[PDB]
Amino acid sequence: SEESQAFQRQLTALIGYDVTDVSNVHDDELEFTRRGLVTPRMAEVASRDPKLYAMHPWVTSKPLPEYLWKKIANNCIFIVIHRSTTSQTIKVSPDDTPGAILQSFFTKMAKQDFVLRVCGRDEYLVGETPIKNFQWVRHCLKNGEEIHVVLDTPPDPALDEVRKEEWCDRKFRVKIRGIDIPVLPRNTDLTVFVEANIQHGQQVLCQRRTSPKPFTEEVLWNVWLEFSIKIKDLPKGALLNLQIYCRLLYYVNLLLIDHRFLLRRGEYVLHMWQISGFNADKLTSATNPDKENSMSISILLDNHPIARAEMPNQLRKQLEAIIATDPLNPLTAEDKELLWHFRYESLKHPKAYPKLFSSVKWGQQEIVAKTYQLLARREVWDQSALDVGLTMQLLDCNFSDENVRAIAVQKLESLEDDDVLHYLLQLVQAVKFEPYHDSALARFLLKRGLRNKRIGHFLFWFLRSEIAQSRHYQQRFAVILEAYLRGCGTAMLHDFTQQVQVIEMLQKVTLDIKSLSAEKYDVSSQVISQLKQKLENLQNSQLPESFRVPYDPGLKAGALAIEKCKVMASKKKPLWLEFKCADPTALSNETIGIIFKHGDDLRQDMLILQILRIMESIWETESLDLCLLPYGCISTGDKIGMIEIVKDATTIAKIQQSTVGNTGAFKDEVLNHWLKEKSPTEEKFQAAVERFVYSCAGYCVATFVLGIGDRHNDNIMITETGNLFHIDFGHERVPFVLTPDFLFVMGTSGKKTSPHFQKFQDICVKAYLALRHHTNLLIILFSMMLMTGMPQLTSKEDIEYIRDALTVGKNEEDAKKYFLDQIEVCRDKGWTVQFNWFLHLVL
Template sequence: MPPAMTDLLDIWAAHSPLAGHVLDQVTVDFLLPTGIYIQMDVPREATIQHIKLLLWKQAQSFPLFPSLGEMESHMFECVNQAAVHEELEDESRRLCDVRPFLPVLRLVTRNCGRAERLLDSKIGVLIGKGLHELDAINDQEVKDFRSKMFRLSEERMQKVQMMTCTEWLQACFSPQLEPPAGPAAPEGLNDRPADLKVIIHFDQSQVRDEDTYTCVDRGCVCLCTFLASVPDCVHIFPAQYANAAHSLPPLAFPRQLVQTCVWDVSQPFKIVLVNGSKVNAEESAKVQVRAGLFHGTELLCKPAVSSESSGRSDHTWNNSTLEFDLSVCDLPRMTRLCFAIYAVMDKVKKQKSTKNLHTNKYQTIPWVNTMVFDYKGQLKTGDIILHCWSSFPDELEEMLNPIGTIQTNPYTENATALHIHFPEYMSHSVVFPPFDKVRHRGWKKFNIELKEIMERDPLSQLCENEKDLIWTLRHDCKDYFPQSLPKLLLSVKWSKHEDMAQLQALLQVWPKLSPRDALELLDFNYPDQYVRKYAVGCLRDMSEEELSQYLLQLVQVLRYEPYYDCALTHFLLERAQGNRKIGHFLFWHLRAEIHMPAVLVQFALILEAYCRGTLSKLKSVNELIKLGTIKNARSKTKEAMLTKEAMMTCLRQSGYSETLSDLHSPLNPNILVEKCRYMDSKMKPLWIVYNNKLLGGDTLGIIFKNGDDLRQDMLTLQILRLMDLLWKEANLDLRIVPYGCLATGDRSGLIEVVSSADTIANIQLTSSNVAAAAAFNKDALLNWLKERNSGDALERAIEEFTLSCAGYCVATYVLGIGDRHSDNIMVRSTGQLFHIDFGHILGNFKSKFGIKRERVPFILTHDFIHVIQEGKTGYTEKFASFRQYCEAAYLVLRKNGNLFITLFALMLTAGLPELTSVKDIQYLKDSLALGKTDEDALKQFRQKFDEALRESWTTKVNWMAHNVAKDNRS
């Protein structure tokens, strides 16, 4: 090494911020490309760049050092926590952030394109999955999607570079910008060239190097060979023979160039079972495979069942063919092929019904799904191995799980594997055609029966006669009930391609729906790609604020997209890259679920695409606190002091304070270590306090929770924000406090702290010397408000309390929110009441020893009434006004009942513990009394209101028990 370089290393090391730090050192083994092995102690918090400098200085005294060359031409590799190789291209990261699986770093020579590699490294850190893992996926769909997203990102970046300063500021920091007038009109199917000429290159062994061909058969009904937007045709001839083409035989094209329309294949659809492995059945059991074809949740024909096979692990079915009672020509484009492998015991075989067959098994039934057509619309052929999933939802008919993912289990080592074969129906590939417009049938007059059907909620089932009526009057639906499109789609016979073609023609002229109505079309029941593209077109009219409101559901319905490249993915990426706020929340909604195997690749690809155009510190502090509180539960006071002191010490470290201070926030807050604490609940959430310089030094608080799934809280708070919006649209402001909540990872996330607020429990306990009596002190809450407000301010505070109490009474009743103890209800000093912690929703109320602890439809205690009536006894005009607020709020929510049902339905596959099936959503239909008149619904709500008042003493008993338990813990 040159002397100047040596001196530079000495000076840098001496003046490094880590110079002199011998604590928190770790012994690392360094493997050099020259074959030299060096063991060295390095600071745990040193950056990779610093460690490389230290290694370079140490390596000077070892043999073959000159062979290494320039230091900048090398980088480190390690095996990370996921047990995969990771290239440490970003050398600004610290060793404690990299967290290698073993303390071994390998020095390797960089390849060319360092800037691109550095970008890839940063993206990998952001999305939590190294891009080399995506590079290793041998899937053409993944490769095509990444290539397309890379190209689109480059195009967007070029557009950004051409922006003026004002345009750039509006794109990145605009608070609320309306989107441009609707999207460009879709390309017309009639915009076709008069003649098709294609230049094709072949190998010498087949035909001439280059020939020009033209389409001459304009009347055939099969799919065009090359372009989906040209007339349907597979008869291709040399251009010079065009006039005499019909007298010549077609050329023998390679198989991949000649395609047949699926509508021309009349054979029954079938598959071949090859074998299964790792089935893990009982020795005496007989194993069978059940297969079904689904479009959404509709079973297209009777399931096919294999013959029986014996054995514990490996099974063969002698290449038996499963034939379905459905022709290939009638397969919908989005057909799913769903499998279930199950063991048939003797006592089960005697049962007549197969509906509950899986409930009598000794083992979990493996299941797996796959698409019949690939992402290009081509009917699958050849062998495929499907790795099954073991967790099986209850109460599914036919033992099949069509709503489950179409991704196979990535953990192949222990997963049941099913080997199947898709046969060939033609000597060349079979593809699904583009839809052509068809003639409209004569219009028929709509009637009262049709209107009644269209006004039903989304959970209502349609009988076959009603479906036939809707389909017959489909044009009337377009003209008079355009919002009825979902019901029309449920009435289409997707196994008839004539109906599908007519539906596609109707979609071209269907009026655009409002974004709220279009959301339902993204449900699993509407898998058709053209329908989903139409729905996304309607969503383009959303403002940024409205898109933020529904972003949680839009991310979840990505699970319903069978192919990575789809209209919804493009829409979300486009809006996210055009608005930083949308992009911020899209990133975290995806990033929070990247650990889930079913969406790992899909979400990683979208995150990578978004990232092209630090919460680990908080988590480690939380782990420290939970470890400290578990060690010694007996000496609680002393242990709590020691644990808080340890947390303070940890947060004071430069690495933590710098990381926390750099958390992205519109107000740029700074952390106040002395005011940070942890909360006295099971998961010991951290209470992080920031100093807000822009608001005169006021503090802001964030609660970091590690160990709780916050996605259910996010959903509930989102619905509360929507209710608040709907009420305000109806000129009813009920002072809702939908505080911020964001899941950021696997069972971890952030919760906004509402300032100047305290819990009902604390307010009651500070007003009484005896915890058991605190819950029954009806004056405690009113006195607390009087202490903080006087004169006109007290009157305003009571009005705030009245309005907010009405809003939360209605909201918690409609949503079925449980676990409403006195620490889960808070009041601000300004009078606003609000609820927190939504771990139990949709009527899942807590019980103990089999006894239901919560017996009221919502919380309305007499101390609440005491505040509303300003301390006066008897029911006054104030109470009458409060009741009217509740009834008016309830009627507003009823008018939007379909929207609430849709939003919850879109979350069905999110994996929330209390939202797993349509039966859970039924609670909303019942609480909103959908299907009843407003008069009958209001009668039902009034009965619930009276019940809440009458049984409020049970709430006080529960609160007393909670206060006593809390007092014993302190």
């Protein structure tokens, strides 16, 4: 069961999707996959340390960078500690453990076992790691801040409680019967054919078509389409893609071999996705749930089972050439046959694997077996250092083979939770490329979130983001998420519930507000009147007392600071909300600020941000900080989500709008003053100058690589404390925004050099070639990003921006003189394109 069916309503309402609904399924893959996951759930649930799980200590094995060792001049560190408006400061050794520090203190107060929390956060310093290796610590030192700790008793694990569970030789052919759309888009007698492809990693094996007929709401052929491929020459995860043309209009897929290794048979009525205008949505095995409006297509199957010598110089070298190559550089057939003939030598090169496996005639069963025997002797891969870029490459759409994909995941198993988070978003996206629901990668995500609450948390929001916005993949994700929620344990089930109700309330309000102020660049008094009036009517008796901040899960927000809440000036109407901090042990009356925004699809922003944090960890590997500000942002539902407000920052635009704010005029010395009025000391000013030269330089490089460099002033921000950063990614050319104002801070005006500018270029080029060292990674992540994150994008030209941008093939010299002349465009242009946003208000 009775209660056992409430849980299921609870789950469904947390998901925003019903994983018991069978209204849209032509088989039992999803249900089977729900059944399949209980073990690996119950596995990880059964084996997780309960107290450690509850404290989710957030921790890294990575070394402390050069820059933060210079921040320590005494091989020793200061930690204040409190009990009840009592507090003392302790000189700690950077290699000291929490448990070890309790000895130096079970010395002090009084002249059982307790634990150290951070003041204000539901973040703990526990377990056998040195303090140098907690992420909070490295955070405090970066910005130059005290470490504040309170001793309370540990979270009871009985709070993590988990609910008890309760579980041929024929050629291939296919009768195309016909199509059916109830209402026709264009009407004027047009002409229409079907196209049926057999697919395996956008490798196409065979293709057949139909005789085109008149496009009326019903079209019937009744034909057998005999393909070139043999039944026994079919691989697992081959898709029967079916498409409609006159040109592309609808598409749909059927996995030819099903999740039991069974050849697929019988009649299918399939409701088709319509094109808008390659793309992961295009890959899905899912069918359109809108049965009333959708094009659909009947078909039929009656087709059972199934489950050296020494190479010469000038060829080794061709091979090494081929292997050295980037991921997006396609293989000649000459190349592919080469990789094949010399498969066993290619096997000694882990970088060869993507290439080598995209050199398989997956359409021949004989070869795939050989390929599998090739996977047997994996000594060289199994023992190789984890290369994420390489690993990821084997997870993208190019690869559809169960076993290939699974070796990549084996490698991931060896990531620490730190790195899991880094790549979590993109790993969660990669599910779209899996041919089946149930998958080693799925299973790997599932595990690791059940293992660590932080991952678990982000995994929730990531899967929820996609479930709510996408019909192509919501069934699949929904299934995985339910699998997660069933083992995260009650505590979180409450937290998640808290969180969901709040963000569901606040989108009501968000949208309600757009309705009122039409476009009109002003926000009527009456709007704020009612914005305010609702937030009262929402706290009154309905909202939660408190809740974790989805983008920063250690922060529990409390009540709203209504006084300070508003709408923003946008053509959109975003909300500016501020909350009190539920956690009264916290140090400040400094509110929690969140923007809520309908209008742009924030999945894209999420992605750009995550990439941004990767580039940052890349610069960690050359001991480099560039002071990016990849603020918090979470996609939550349809063209809507939330954003961290960054305290004490304004818009580059607005810094112009202060002294002037004219109908579009710009001055050069103005930034520089905006810093001095905000820099109490003059030392701090030149620091603020310092922070900017980093932030500017990094944002210049990163933004050029991703190809999002030409922005408005309005969509760039600086902190009162010198930290520049771009925003609003959901939104003559110039490679990036290095304006004349940015340079008069550097001591230069359009055509000179200086002590702080010389510096800027120094950093830029160093940052730039640093990323070039991790080229393939950035290529693979961008490519996938485009494929999972975007509109439609040309499966050559859009994806391929980034290799011309990372100046591939080229030497650190040529490459530098590339990036350098990129700077001497913003010099020539200057205000020229900043100038331009507005004028085009009429062109």
